[PDB]
Design a protein around this motif. Structure first.
Motif, PDB file in Angstrom:
ATOM      1  N   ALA A  30       0.795  -1.232   0.000  1.00 46.21           N
ATOM      2  CA  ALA A  30       0.000   0.000   0.000  1.00 46.21           C
ATOM      3  C   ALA A  30       0.839   1.299   0.000  1.00 46.21           C
ATOM      4  O   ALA A  30       0.391   2.301  -0.565  1.00 46.21           O
ATOM      5  N   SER A  32       3.752   1.910  -1.639  1.00 45.92           N
ATOM      6  CA  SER A  32       4.176   2.121  -3.027  1.00 45.92           C
ATOM      7  C   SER A  32       3.044   2.719  -3.876  1.00 45.92           C
ATOM      8  O   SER A  32       3.272   3.639  -4.667  1.00 45.92           O
ATOM      9  N   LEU A  33       1.806   2.250  -3.671  1.00 42.78           N
ATOM     10  CA  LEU A  33       0.637   2.764  -4.387  1.00 42.78           C
ATOM     11  C   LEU A  33       0.313   4.205  -3.964  1.00 42.78           C
ATOM     12  O   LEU A  33       0.176   5.075  -4.821  1.00 42.78           O
ATOM     13  N   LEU A  34       0.234   4.488  -2.657  1.00 39.06           N
ATOM     14  CA  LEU A  34      -0.069   5.834  -2.160  1.00 39.06           C
ATOM     15  C   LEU A  34       1.022   6.847  -2.546  1.00 39.06           C
ATOM     16  O   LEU A  34       0.703   7.962  -2.957  1.00 39.06           O
ATOM     17  N   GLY A  36       3.005   6.758  -5.196  1.00 37.71           N
ATOM     18  CA  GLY A  36       2.874   7.006  -6.631  1.00 37.71           C
ATOM     19  C   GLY A  36       1.622   7.813  -7.000  1.00 37.71           C
ATOM     20  O   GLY A  36       1.708   8.761  -7.784  1.00 37.71           O
ATOM     21  N   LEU A  37       0.464   7.499  -6.409  1.00 41.67           N
ATOM     22  CA  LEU A  37      -0.791   8.203  -6.687  1.00 41.67           C
ATOM     23  C   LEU A  37      -0.752   9.672  -6.252  1.00 41.67           C
ATOM     24  O   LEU A  37      -1.247  10.517  -6.996  1.00 41.67           O
ATOM     25  N   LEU A  38      -0.130  10.013  -5.116  1.00 37.74           N
ATOM     26  CA  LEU A  38      -0.045  11.410  -4.668  1.00 37.74           C
ATOM     27  C   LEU A  38       0.765  12.246  -5.676  1.00 37.74           C
ATOM     28  O   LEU A  38       0.416  13.393  -5.954  1.00 37.74           O
TER      29      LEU A  38
END
Lengths: 48, 125, 57
Positions: A30, A32-34, A36-38
Motif C-alpha cells: 500500500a 508504493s501505491l499511495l 505514486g498516486l499522490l
C-alpha cells in the motif's frame, strides 16, 4: 488564472501538496501505491 | 455479464463502454478480469491492455487499475515514468533556472511597477 | 500636413484594423479548443482523489 466566464479571467493561488465498508486487494504494498498516486495527483492539478 | 470500463489519462479519455473481460499486465503478473471481480487496486506495467466486448487492444505506458464489482477504472499514463527520465526532467528544469537568474535585484520596486501598469492598462480599454 | 500623406496613413491603419478583427474570431476558436481540453482531463483527477481518500482513510 481561472475561467469564471468568456469575459472574466480570475487570478488565483491553489494549495497543491498538503491536501466505506470494504477494502481493496492490494497486489503491491500500500505504501508504493499511495506514494505514486499522490505524485500523479499533483502533476494532474498542475496540468489542469 | 458486463461492467463499465473507463480507460482514462491526465489529458483525455482512451475508452469508455461495456466489457465482458479485461486483460491487464499488473506489477506482479498477467490478470484476466470479468464481471463481479472483488475490489482491487494495482500498478500497471507498460504494455497492451486487451478487452472483450468482439476484441479491442490499446497500448498504455503504465498507470493504475482500480476495480470495484460494478466499475473498472484504468488511470493510464501518457509517458513511461522511470528513475532516469523522472530525474532528467528535474535536472533540466533546475539547469533552466540556473541559466535564467544571474543575481538579486531591487524588490521594493514591485508595488510601483504594478501601480504603473495598472494605470496604463486602464487607458487602453 | 498634406492630403496624400494623410490618405496613406488611413490606408495603413485600415489594413491593420482588418487583421485585428479576424484575430478576435481566431482567439474565440482557440478558446473553445482549450475549454474542451479542460473538460477532457477532469475524470482522471477526480478518480485519483477518490482512491487516495480510502487508501489513506
Amino acid at each position: 488564472n481561472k475561467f469564471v466566464n468568456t469575459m472574466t479571467q480570475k487570478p488565483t493561488v491553489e494549495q497543491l501538496i498538503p491536501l466505506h465498508h470494504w477494502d481493496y486487494l492490494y497486489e503491491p504494498d500500500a505504501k508504493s501505491l499511495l506514494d505514486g498516486l499522490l505524485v500523479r495527483y499533483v502533476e494532474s492539478q498542475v496540468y489542469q | 455479464i458486463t461492467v463499465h470500463c473507463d480507460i482514462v489519462s491526465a489529458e483525455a479519455e482512451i475508452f469508455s463502454g461495456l466489457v465482458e473481460m479485461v486483460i491487464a499486465h499488473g506489477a506482479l503478473g498477467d490478470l484476466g478480469i470479468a464481471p463481479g471481480h472483488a475490489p482491487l487496486i494495482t500498478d500497471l506495467k507498460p504494455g497492451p491492455i486487451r478487452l472483450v466486448k468482439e476484441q479491442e487492444v490499446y497500448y498504455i505506458s503504465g498507470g493504475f487499475l482500480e476495480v470495484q464489482p460494478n466499475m473498472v477504472k484504468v488511470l493510464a499514463d501518457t509517458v513511461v515514468r522511470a528513475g532516469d527520465l523522472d530525474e532528467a526532467a528535474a535536472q533540466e528544469a533546475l539547469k533552466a533556472a540556473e541559466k535564467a537568474l544571474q543575481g538579486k535585484g531591487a524588490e521594493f520596486d514591485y508595488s510601483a511597477a504594478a501601480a504603473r501598469l495598472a494605470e496604463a492598462a486602464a487607458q487602453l480599454r | 500636413a498634406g492630403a496624400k500623406e494623410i490618405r496613406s496613413k488611413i490606408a495603413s491603419i485600415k489594413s491593420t484594423q482588418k487583421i485585428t478583427n479576424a484575430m478576435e474570431k481566431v482567439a474565440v476558436s482557440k478558446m473553445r479548443k482549450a475549454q474542451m481540453r479542460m473538460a477532457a482531463g477532469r475524470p482522471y483527477a477526480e478518480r485519483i482523489r477518490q482512491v487516495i481518500g480510502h487508501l489513506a482513510n
